[PDB]
Amino acid sequence: ISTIQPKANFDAQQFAGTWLLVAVGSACRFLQEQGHRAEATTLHVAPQGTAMAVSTFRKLDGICWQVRQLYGDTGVLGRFLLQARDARGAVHVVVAETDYQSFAVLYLERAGQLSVKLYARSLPVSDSVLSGFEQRVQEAHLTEDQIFYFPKYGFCEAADQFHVLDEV
Amino acid sequence: PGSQKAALGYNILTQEDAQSVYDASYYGGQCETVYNGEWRELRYDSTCE
């Protein structure tokens, strides 16, 4: 893990409910090269007790796709592992900063890879939160070229029976 | 996948599949490949989104 720590006394309960992905600062060139065509990503969250049920939804080519992932508890309040589903590896996710009624900042780290996400309960996000997240990006040593903003419309709750990836 | 299933013998009286008649696994030094048209398996990377 990088020099990062969770939200103090993180509460899975209040963090529960829908979150909208605002922006992702990442070294992953996938957002760099063809960072356009990244759909408005919504993230329904529910306390799986210690774990969190985390259903990402997207419009993959306009197909509404739910991807249900367990953010499994690592054993530290506000840090999660996501099973290590496959050669995707373990993904160390930390809720670094949030107020549960408007915004949260999540850190996601993989071997040689760090990524930070800004989520908001509603859109637009406050400018103070925006610039705070941009500071978090500087503290992650990422550049402005490595911040990618996700469109504000076309959120797609309710993937059907079949467009549900259910990675677990 | 399923190539072993075509190699089975067949009991016409029972219509049960029987033990492997053909070798489902021997390649005889052939390097022949079959395009898996349904290879295209959806993945999600939470880090890259």
Record the tokens describing residue B45, joined without a space.
Answer: 């990377």
Question: Residue A108, class by beta-carbon neighbours within 10 Å (0-12 exposed, 13-18 middle, 19+ buried)?
Answer: buried
Task: Confirm if A40 and A150 have CB atoms less than 8 A apart.
Answer: yes
The amino acid occupying position A131 is S
Among the partner residues A31, A82, A167, nearest to B49 by beta-carbon distance: A31
**Which residues partner with A118 through β-bridges?**
A23, A105
Which residue of A67, A70, A71, A119 is the best one to mutate when testing the B interface, meaning the one whose CB has the most B CBs within 10 A?
A: A67
Chain B from 5 to 44: CB within 8 A of any A CB: 42-44
Q: Which residues of B touch A147 (CB under 8 A)?
A: none
3-state secondary structure of A33: coil
HEC profile of A93-142: EEEEEEECCCEEEEEEEECCEEEEEEEECCCCCCHHHHHHHHHHHHHCCC
The amino acid occupying position B15 is Q
Among the partner residues B43, B46, B48, nearest to A31 by beta-carbon distance: B48
Q: Which residues of A touch B43 (CB under 8 A)?
A: 88
Given 3-state DSSP classes, what are the helix, strand and coil percentages for chain A, each rounded to the nearest 5?
Answer: 15, 40, 45
Record the tokens describing residue A64, joined without a space.
Answer: 């509404």
Which residue of A19, A21, A22, A28 is the best one to mutate when testing the B interface, meaning the one whose CB has the most B CBs within 10 A?
A: A28
**Which residues partner with A120 through β-bridges?**
A20, A103
Half-sphere exposure (Cβ direction) of A128: Cα atoms closer than 13 Å? 4
- Cα separation of A103 and A111, whole Å? 27
What sign has the CA pseudo-torsion A146, A70, A97, A17? positive
Half-sphere exposure (Cβ direction) of B42: Cα atoms closer than 13 Å? 13
Among the partner residues B43, B46, B48, nearest to A82 by beta-carbon distance: B46
Closest CA to A96 of A88, A107, A87: A107
- This entry's atomic model was obtained through cryo-EM
Record the tokens describing residue B25, joined without a space.
Answer: 């696994």
